């Protein structure tokens, strides 16, 4: 086909017409991933060195898309990734992605292809991660995310904008902190989540690509809130998180296209686990439609859905039981906040019957978690049933058996 040597040699040939066709021929074959060959390792490296020197000096406006395409393809290789991880190479991409604090009109295809290059370099090059922080790309990247309602940007550039935001905040502590503290990240991404859901008549089904965007938003929101929320929050912050929690309540009650409904709820529940737990009362504020689950004059659709997610997530896991802790701690706080919730979950999880650990029952799988290797999963499992048991040690011992309940009574002191 179009080998990397022949593309390199075509570049050593000075004619711009053969380099244009040889790049397009290379961009057609190697666009998919199974074209990757360990035999063409060095020939891909020497071609990157040729292209990078053009990029950090300026790409001609004509055929600019095909030049970024070959770099986006070569950026999938960890060997050629170094050559582009330079201060001016990443400044060129940031300018073509329009997030470089330069302009102070957009070709949507050059804009998107640059974003995919930055995502590949930031993903695996710690030098690119450092230089992207230093270039403060998060500033105008968060700004474009806030103008998504005014500026009709395509789905692809919206997805890779949010993915780069995800990669920057996951891989750089400083960028994660300035999105939260200086760039109003929670409030900004909360508005982006609502726009992506079409909320404000509940949301029942989310389209395939609106789900893809919303999951990435939930991932960035998880990053900037995982350790930055004090839970001793302002009255203004408590309203912001209660607003965000209301959006997550819609996600809990909704469905996504494809099989993504499982991943979609997991991201939702993960974010709920980061909220100030007094803001979780929003989960119980859902007013009673008729077409509901009712318990003691309170809507229990939300808590039934979380319970369903717990029972499903409990089945799939074998040794990654950590992914069950977020829904457990959300359901535990509801049972503390609410009395009809404490009583509804007690009937569903620990119904009066007549061997606490043996069995395929939900009560049995939970008691098995009280004897576990992870210290957090074993504590959230016991605390859940303990709260459901009205925090009574004798009743707590009856349902869980004393052998399993000894850890909770000893650790609590």
Curated annotation (Swiss-Prot):
Gene encoding the protein: Ric8a
Impact noted for substituting residue 373 to E: Reduced ability to promote guanine exchange of G-alpha proteins
Coiled coil (UniProt feature): none
Species this chain originates from: Rattus norvegicus (Rat)
GO molecular function: G-protein alpha-subunit binding; GTPase activator activity; guanyl-nucleotide exchange factor activity; protein folding chaperone
Localization of this protein: Cytoplasm, Cell cortex; Cytoplasm
Consequence when changing residue 406 to W: Does not greatly affect ability to fold GNAQ
GO BP terms: adenylate cyclase-inhibiting G protein-coupled receptor signaling pathway; basement membrane organization; cell migration involved in gastrulation; cell-cell adhesion involved in gastrulation; G protein-coupled receptor signaling pathway; gastrulation; in utero embryonic development; response to light stimulus
Effect upon mutating residue 402 to A: Does not affect ability to promote guanine exchange of G-alpha proteins
Outcome following mutation: residue 405 to W: Strongly reduced ability to promote guanine exchange of G-alpha proteins
Protein name as annotated: Chaperone Ric-8A
Effect the entry attributes to changing residue 222 to W: Does not affect ability to fold GNAQ
Family: Belongs to the synembryn family.
GO cellular component: cell cortex; cytoplasm; membrane; plasma membrane
Keywords carried by this UniProt record: Chaperone, Cytoplasm, Guanine-nucleotide releasing factor, Phosphoprotein
Function, in words: Chaperone that specifically binds and folds nascent G alpha proteins prior to G protein heterotrimer formation, promoting their stability and activity: folds GNAI1, GNAO1, GNA13 and GNAQ. Does not fold G(s) G-alpha proteins GNAS nor GNAL. Also acts as a guanine nucleotide exchange factor (GEF) for G alpha proteins by stimulating exchange of bound GDP for free GTP.
Listed result of changing residue 171 to W: Does not affect ability to fold GNAQ
Assembly with partners or alone: Interacts with GDP-bound G alpha proteins GNAI1, GNAO1 and GNAQ, and with GNA13 with lower affinity. Does not interact with G-alpha proteins when they are in complex with subunits beta and gamma. Interacts (via C-terminus) with RGS14; the interaction stimulates the dissociation of the complex between RGS14 and the active GTP-bound form of GNAI1. Interacts with NCS1; interaction is favored in the absence of Ca(2+) and myristoylation of NCS1 is not required.
